[PDB]
């Protein structure tokens, strides 16, 4: 994605403050609660019967760290998302068969989590930068069709 030098700096600055052990699980848990049909993909994670069970589910939190990890990787290779997410793209498109519209949903839930955690610090321009970032990641994961 084409981030502005200013944007790139603001994005990296905020990300450095993200709790890598919790943010991904919070975003994934919210995806499952806000867009409930997504729970179908994670039925092997156990109890996802209510919002509290989803948010408190150990496997959701553990898996969320891996998802946050992939987002960090994307942040480090904004220049070539397509190639960075090639393996994940094949997984989600061929193995998982997740409709691409869902990738955009997780990216936007992640943005809501950043806003929730950083409050006023997640300014409109900072959000605009992150929106390019997550659209890039979503676009990179949907390339197996694209």
């Amino acid at each position: 994605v084409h981030l502005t030098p200013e944007e790139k700096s603001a994005v990296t600055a905020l990300w450095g403050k993200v709790n890598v052990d919790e943010v991904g699980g919070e975003a994934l848990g919210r995806l499952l609660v806000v867009y409930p049909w997504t729970q179908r993909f994670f039925e092997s994670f156990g109890d996802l019967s209510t919002p509290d069970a989803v948010m408190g589910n150990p496997k959701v939190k553990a898996h969320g760290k891996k998802v946050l990890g992939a987002f960090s990787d994307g942040l480090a290779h904004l220049d070539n998302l397509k190639g960075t997410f090639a393996t994940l793209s094949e997984l989600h498109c061929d193995k998982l068969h997740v409709d691409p519209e869902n990738f955009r949903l997780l990216g936007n839930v992640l943005v809501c989590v950043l806003a929730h955690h950083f409050g006023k610090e997640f300014t409109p321009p900072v959000q605009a930068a992150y929106q390019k970032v997550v659209a890039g990641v979503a676009n990179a994961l949907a390339h197996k069709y694209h």
């Binding site: 609660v33 806000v34 867009y35 943005v111």
Partner: protein, 141 residues
């Protein structure tokens, strides 16, 4: 379609906005304009600079419409018919733009109401904005 709990959730969270209506509405629009520039084409004549009084004025109209929709959560087509006339019949706004403004409204609520913006409430608000968007993009008159 909203569950009883969704209505409860929505009225409780939005009731917290109160007199912040205008400010939050403006912030949601500004976030949208900046994050998804293609949406500015629906306001070609507006002054969209940061802090614009035009956007601040329009943002209060939008939030108060949401306030009115929350009050009539069980009878939205009738309550928002005038807004449907505007968005579906006159402006012809593409439904995708409603998802963008809805997302910017949720981002704005999350940045300001951390305690209130729980997964459950976030879920109910998202569905509510989707309900609102369906009415404003449908021609039912």
């Amino acid at each position: 379609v909203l569950s009883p709990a969704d209505k409860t959730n929505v009225k409780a969270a939005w009731g917290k906005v109160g007199a912040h209506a205008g400010e939050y509405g403006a912030e949601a629009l500004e976030r949208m304009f900046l994050s998804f520039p293609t949406t500015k084409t629906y306001f070609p004549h507006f002054d969209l600079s940061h802090g614009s009084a035009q956007v601040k004025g329009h943002g209060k109209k939008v939030a108060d419409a949401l306030t009115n929709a929350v009050a009539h959560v069980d009878d939205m087509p009738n309550a928002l018919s005038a807004l449907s006339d505007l968005h579906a019949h006159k402006l012809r706004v593409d439904p995708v733009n409603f998802k963008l403004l809805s997302h910017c409204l949720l981002v704005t609520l999350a940045a300001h109401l951390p305690a209130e913006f729980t997964p459950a409430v976030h879920a109910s608000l998202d569905k509510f904005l989707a309900s609102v968007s369906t009415v404003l993009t449908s021609k039912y008159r």
